[PDB]
Design a protein around this ligand. Structure first.
Ligand SMILES: [Mg+2]
Ligand SMILES: [Mg+2]
Ligand SMILES: [Mg+2]
Ligand SMILES: [Mg+2]
Ligand SMILES: [Mg+2]
Ligand SMILES: [Mg+2]
Ligand SMILES: [Mg+2]
Ligand SMILES: [Mg+2]
Ligand SMILES: [Mg+2]
Ligand SMILES: [Mg+2]
Ligand SMILES: [Mg+2]
Ligand SMILES: [Mg+2]
Ligand SMILES: [Mg+2]
Ligand SMILES: [Mg+2]
Ligand SMILES: [Mg+2]
Ligand SMILES: [Mg+2]
Ligand SMILES: [Mg+2]
Ligand SMILES: [Mg+2]
Ligand SMILES: [Mg+2]
Ligand SMILES: [Mg+2]
Ligand SMILES: [Mg+2]
Ligand SMILES: [Mg+2]
Ligand SMILES: [Mg+2]
Ligand SMILES: [Mg+2]
Ligand SMILES: [Mg+2]
Ligand SMILES: [Mg+2]
Ligand SMILES: [Mg+2]
Ligand SMILES: [Mg+2]
Ligand SMILES: [Mg+2]
Ligand SMILES: [Mg+2]
Ligand SMILES: [Mg+2]
Ligand SMILES: [Mg+2]
Ligand SMILES: [Mg+2]
Lengths: 188, 260, 125, 155
RNA sequence: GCCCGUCGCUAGUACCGAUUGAAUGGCUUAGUGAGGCCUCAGGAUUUGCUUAGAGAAGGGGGCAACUCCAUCUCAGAGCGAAGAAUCUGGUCAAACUUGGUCAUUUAGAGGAACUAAAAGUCGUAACAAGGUUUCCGUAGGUGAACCUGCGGAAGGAUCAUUA
RNA sequence: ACCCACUCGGCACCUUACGAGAAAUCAAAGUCUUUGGGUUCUGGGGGGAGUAUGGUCGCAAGGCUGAAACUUAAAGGAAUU
RNA sequence: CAGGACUUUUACUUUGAAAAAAUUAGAGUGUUCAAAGCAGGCGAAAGCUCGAAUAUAUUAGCAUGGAAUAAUGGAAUAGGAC
RNA sequence: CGGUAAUUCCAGCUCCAGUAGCGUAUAUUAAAGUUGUUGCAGUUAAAAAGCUCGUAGUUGAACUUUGGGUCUGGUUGUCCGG
RNA sequence: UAUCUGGUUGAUCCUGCCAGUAGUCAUAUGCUUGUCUCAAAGAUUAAGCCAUGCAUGUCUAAGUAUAAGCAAUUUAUACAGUGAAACUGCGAAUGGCUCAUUAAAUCAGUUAUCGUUUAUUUGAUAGUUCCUUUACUACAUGGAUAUCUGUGGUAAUUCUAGAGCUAAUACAUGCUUAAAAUCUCGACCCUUUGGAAGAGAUGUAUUUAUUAGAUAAAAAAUCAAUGUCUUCGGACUCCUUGAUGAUUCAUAAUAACUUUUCGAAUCGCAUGGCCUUGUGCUGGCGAUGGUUCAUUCAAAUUUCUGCCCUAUCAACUUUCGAUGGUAGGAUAGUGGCCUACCAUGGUUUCAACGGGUAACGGGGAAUAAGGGUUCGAUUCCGGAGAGGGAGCCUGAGAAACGGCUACCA
């Protein structure tokens, strides 16, 4: 099997090392999960010392965080748009860590509406009062707002889906988001 | 090679078992327990090779079974149970109580003790941390975890555990000019005062120790076990009060105290 | 895989086999003390040599130095006990001057002879 | 080492779990995290004020300096963000009662908080394995300027 | 007296070597590739929930949607859950076919050696100024020591010719 | 230009060694069992052999590098009658 | 003490801490002697009691004392020190 | 050594050595200052590169706080055994 | 325990060797061989091949007996004495052997894990499983399957088909449970100094965010929010915070997530205490289990320094990862460990690389003035391997061979 040993490697000097000891189970490494989008399918793998890692071959949903607001919502992932490591992955639609994906965003929008009442694209008294107490806090980065109008938000996955089975991340914000956008533009 | 080792060869044993070179190929390997393998002392050794109450392993086993040996109040039935430093071994019949303390030379000494002291165990502090639900716990260098400790108990401080329940009754802060016991190295079994504590923030603090006879020596911090305020120890120390004589001196003593 | 047993060769052969004078001396010694072999003599010599090695080493260390004071003293005591050194010569410097005769004149052989009980060494043996 | 740009490759490079809330505007605008390594060593002003990134920096990254702290002269700067340190010593040959002059090159990691030329003497600290050969991270560069003050002979 | 080489004889070592020689092992080009593991399917069979109509002789405490019961129980069928053979791609990768390569061995027609034994043959090269003083570098020549150029060295047969 | 006296540097030489050395001899071949100023190179009985082989340098002759099997109680040095 | 503030950097040597046990050197001890072993010894011979030491290993790392020897560094466009 | 007196062969007798052991073979250590750091040789016995330059290596003149004085701890010889 | 002696000559002094001499937990072998104690012993060649037998199994008052077993006799009309079998649990990863590989590998001393896994151990430890709160499994839930009884298959094997019953600490499901405090929502009143009736949520584990995890000292002015006591001038006071050399640490908090882990439907012996006189409510000593944190036995890596000959090996590594970067994948976790994109490094006359080893490394052994030289398959410690190469299952732990799968022999 795939082994993470440094035995098979050459030394710093470039010397080809001799074959001492046949590969061990503590050196072992398993096949890549390389998770796809659509219909939840999670295979558990028995690791060292008991314990399970969860291979996430085919994932659809994920809970993503809006770090500015301080809220996270369970939402559908619809397509990988950019991945820093490989364009092949993007082509495939391979969900991994640090991949950039499009989120259904509707739940986020709903949450926003509940909170401030301002809406994106264009009742009780206590609620009104609450809204009044807030406001001006509801401004947001323009890019995010624009994205909302289309209905699909850019988010980065921060979970390792091949490890946890869980697919999670953060909605793209500030400078990083801008950078990502620029990259995307360049690619096109 | 493949999982844990389960045997111990007779030569590979700790030397302070005082185990004879012959009469067997194997030594009694201390089971997973409160004390470290090399720093421990298995019950079998204590029974057979110290007090001589048993003649062989079978005898020891038999003794154990009738629920009579007690390590720190709790019963025990393992032949290879690792009772270590400060552990109180109580035998119900005989009514003898023992505390496992080192002697001037290095090995574990048979130290007979009264029931008034046998009630408590003295223990060094290894770790101080907040556990789950923010609850503070102390870790004794001798096995235990004690929840909700007095919050000015730090690392290296020694603690009087009441043993019957397992609560901290009192403690000694680690400081200069406090009676100390050495539990590792060449200086193991020696009693002293702590003159000075060197730091070297990076690797291994060294403590300077003077004994009663004004005779200074240096050991690592993790080998040093506080015992009280100078001249007044919290436990009874064994005969020769952890003093270390020179060889010639020892010889002289042997000669002059002849009474055959 | 049991713990090994210690052996020790307790004698040493001469470094030159047919040194005639030496041989004759050995023979004489044997005659004196009813010795079955040259081997016995060799053993004695070896023993003497060991002692000498110790003594020399001790001497090499400073006098009034701990090790010398101890080990050397012990050696001296042992010698006196065995009866090879005399009470006049509890010195460590005198330990070097011992010579093979003093060990042979201390065997249960010779002693037996010298207290009566025998009529010659062979009889005693 | 870095050498200019900062935001220079395929992925956005940020200090993990450091958040710069883009609503309430701050003085620094983007928050920089640093720590002092300890052992009496000082975190340089180049590390705190700088715009560079590095996970493998002992000040602004995730690696922790522990174990052995070595010193030696710099042999090679050529490979990006790292260094090679020569470490001359004397090996005692007991038969001849004398000493061999010996060698051993230590590859080490260079935080972009430092200016390192070939020939500078460098204090290097042990950390978690960083690459195939690197175990060490540069803590202090001792050759500060050399003769950058008065290079020209004219009084 | 000592003594050198050629050609002889008898043994014994190693050397070169035609044989498109042979053998074993290590890498390796091209192509094949068992078996597991992972994965896309597949779905023998295995059961659970549907009230899905029963014959049932209180098929829930007395003719009756049994004063209908996990009721008698199969056509249901829908909905699951478990799942073997088989199977698509991987991945690790033993091995196998034909080559090439390095290493170590191994037959080996022949050839060129050296040592040992030193009552063979031809001289006498060297040791005396060895009967042409020896050596040395080099080149040519010879039956063999060797001889002869050119330069050198006394380890030479000369520490020697003032003015 | 000589002459005398001194002086550094050189090619040597003569007599003594009180030092060396197996001796022949040597002002170094001395200041070494009373053994250490600094350094580079080379040798480890005689043959086989400066051969075989592999490199490498030569147009070539050759050079530099350089074995082993086996063989042998001596080969040698300086002096002696 | 407990904290800064920075300390030219070594080599060398010192004492200390570590260099598993066996082996080695070695203390004790009539295995009948010895090679060995870690035993034993003394009583009223009703129970009591010494033991099971020490010393070595220098290579490397660690700790501290030393400042001869050997090296390295500072003020010469002073951008030097207070 | 042995070719007709063999102290060396083969035996007999005596004798020597080690002795429940002693011999032979092949390694290996001491002997070996015949591997040399301590510690070898190189004019003639083996051996000084034909000669010079020269990077690594090894090695590399002298020179910076020495001298005094004042008390004060020990540690063995002494001056008696107080 | 500092030693030499025979041999180059007619004789001499040397250089030099050869020969002798002594030892060898150094092997072989030749003769001999009475006793006592101690005791190596198929390493060397072939890590060559193996007849036959054995070398790992295991049960306590305390997981599961309707053996149609034995008991048999003065606890059983549920069982209850022993107890084969079988299920379950645990072990079989230790030990034992061997030295083939292996030359910066192993290994030794030394660090490190702020870089991880860890059955067992000894400490710790979980009122929160509920989900609206006028009639609900909890005095206890479900279906299997072994042995067994019967029907067989095959020349055969520790090959197992078919039927019939039947267990669990096997396999599945799944109840109790408070009080408080805190966070999401407001039927209204009364024009402020606003302030609330009551409804939902909160264990742990999991995941990604995010926040707290302070601390070099004292004294202000006031601009935006605007509290609390007002003895209606205005005061504002007593305002949390562990560890390390050092962290994004320990830990806590808000956000949610999750094919929702765990939170005892388990056993043995005791048979004690209050009467609301039920058979009620209770309660002792233990076994097994189970969560995270300890610790212990361990574990992978890991720092610095040190290996034997060889230059008749001087350049080596880099298409097929060589050295470094970035991101991901993978792993128990770190890392070119692997993948993508990029950069051109890394080692070396202070011998890299290659070659050899009749090389496992070390503790040590033989020798024995001082310095050394040679040996270490072998009783202890590491490491490898089970004919050769792969590949895996089970498990805390194996790339296991007295486990399995294949190929080659
Ligand atoms: Mg776990
Ligand atoms: Mg630390
Ligand atoms: Mg396949
Ligand atoms: Mg002639
Ligand atoms: Mg002539
Ligand atoms: Mg000559
Ligand atoms: Mg020769
Ligand atoms: Mg001559
Ligand atoms: Mg001894
Ligand atoms: Mg005759
Ligand atoms: Mg020798
Ligand atoms: Mg010589
Ligand atoms: Mg010559
Ligand atoms: Mg000088
Ligand atoms: Mg000698
Ligand atoms: Mg001659
Ligand atoms: Mg003659
Ligand atoms: Mg000899
Ligand atoms: Mg008898
Ligand atoms: Mg064999
Ligand atoms: Mg079983
Ligand atoms: Mg084993
Ligand atoms: Mg923070
Ligand atoms: Mg954390
Ligand atoms: Mg990474
Ligand atoms: Mg081998
Ligand atoms: Mg070896
Ligand atoms: Mg070995
Ligand atoms: Mg072998
Ligand atoms: Mg075999
Ligand atoms: Mg295997
Ligand atoms: Mg077997
Ligand atoms: Mg096995």
């Amino acid at each position: 099997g795939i082994s993470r040993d440094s035995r098979h490697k050459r030394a710093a000097t470039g010397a080809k090392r001799a074959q001492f000891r046949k590969k061990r189970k503590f050196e072992l490494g398993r096949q890549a999960a390389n998770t796809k989008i659509g219909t939840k399918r999670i295979h558990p793998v028995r690791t060292r010392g008991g314990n399970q890692k969860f291979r996430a071959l085919r994932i659809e949903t994920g809970n993503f965080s809006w770090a500015s607001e301080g809220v996270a919502r369970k939402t559908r992932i619809t397509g990988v748009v950019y991945h820093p490591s490989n364009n092949e992955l993007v082509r495939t639609n391979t969900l991994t860590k640090a991949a950039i994906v499009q989120i259904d965003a509707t739940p986020f929008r709903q949450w926003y509406e509940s909170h401030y009442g301002q809406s994106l694209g264009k009742t009780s008294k206590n609620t009104e009062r609450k809204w009044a107490a807030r406001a001006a806090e509801a401004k947001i980065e323009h890019a995010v707002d624009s994205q909302f109008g289309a209905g699909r938000l850019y988010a980065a996955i921060s979970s390792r889906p091949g490890q946890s089975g869980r697919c999670d991340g953060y909605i793209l914000e500030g400078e990083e988001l801008a950078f990502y956008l620029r990259r995307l533009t360049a690619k096109k | 090679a493949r999982g844990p080792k389960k045997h111990l060869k007779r030569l590979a044993a700790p030397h302070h078992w005082m185990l004879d070179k012959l009469s067997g190929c194997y030594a009694p390997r201390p089971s997973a327990g409160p004390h470290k393998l090399r720093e421990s002392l298995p019950l079998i050794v204590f029974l057979r090779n110290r007090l001589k109450y048993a003649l062989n392993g079978r005898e020891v086993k038999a003794i154990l079974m009738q629920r009579h040996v007690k390590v720190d109040g709790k019963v025990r039935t393992d032949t290879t149970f690792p009772a270590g430093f400060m552990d109180v071994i109580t035998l119900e019949a005989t009514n003898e109580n023992f505390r496992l303390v080192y002697d001037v030379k290095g090995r574990f000494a048979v130290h007979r003790i009264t029931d008034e002291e046998a009630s408590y165990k003295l223990a060094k502090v290894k770790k101080v941390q907040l556990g789950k639900k923010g609850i503070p716990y102390v870790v004794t260098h001798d096995g235990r975890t004690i929840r909700y400790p007095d919050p000015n108990i730090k690392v290296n401080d020694t603690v009087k555990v009441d043993l019957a329940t397992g609560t901290i009754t009192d403690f000694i802060k680690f400081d200069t000019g406090k009676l100390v016991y050495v539990t590792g190295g060449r200086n193991l079994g020696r009693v002293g005062t702590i003159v000075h504590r060197e730091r070297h923030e990076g690797g291994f603090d060294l403590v300077h120790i003077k004994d009663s006879l004004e005779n200074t020596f240096v050991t690592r911090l993790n080998n040093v076990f506080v015992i009280g305020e100078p001249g007044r120890p919290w436990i009874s120390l064994p005969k020769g009060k952890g003093i270390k004589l020179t060889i010639s001196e020892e010889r002289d003593r042997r000669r002059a105290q002849h009474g055959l | 895989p049991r713990a090994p047993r210690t052996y020790s060769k307790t004698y040493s052969t001469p470094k030159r086999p047919y040194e005639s004078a030496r041989l004759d001396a050995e023979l004489k010694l044997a005659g004196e003390y009813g010795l079955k072999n040259k081997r016995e003599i060799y053993r004695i010599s070896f023993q003497l040599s060991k002692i000498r090695r110790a003594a020399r080493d001790l001497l090499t260390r400073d006098e009034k130095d701990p090790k010398r004071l101890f080990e050397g003293n012990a050696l001296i005591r042992r010698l006196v006990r065995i009866g090879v050194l005399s009470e006049d010569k509890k010195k460590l410097d005198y330990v070097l001057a011992l010579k093979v005769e003093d060990f042979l004149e201390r065997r249960l052989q010779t002693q037996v002879y010298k207290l009566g009980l025998a009529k010659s060494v062979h009889h005693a043996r | 080492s870095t050498e200019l740009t900062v935001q220079s490759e395929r992925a956005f490079q940020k200090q993990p779990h450091i958040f710069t809330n883009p609503k309430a505007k701050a003085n620094r605008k983007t928050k920089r995290w640093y720590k002092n390594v300890g052992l009496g060593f000082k975190t340089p002003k180049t590390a705190i004020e700088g715009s560079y990134i590095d996970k493998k920096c002992p000040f602004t990254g995730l690696v922790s300096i522990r174990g052995k702290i070595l010193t030696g002269t710099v042999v090679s700067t050529r490979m990006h963000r790292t260094i090679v340190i020569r470490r001359d010593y004397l090996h005692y040959v007991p038969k001849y009662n004398r000493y061999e002059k010996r060698h051993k090159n230590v590859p080490a990691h260079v935080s972009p908080a430092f200016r390192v030329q070939v020939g500078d003497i460098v204090t290097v600290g042990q950390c978690r394995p960083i690459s195939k050969t690197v175990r060490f991270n540069v803590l202090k560069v001792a050759s500060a300027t050399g003769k950058a003050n008065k290079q020209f002979a004219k009084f």
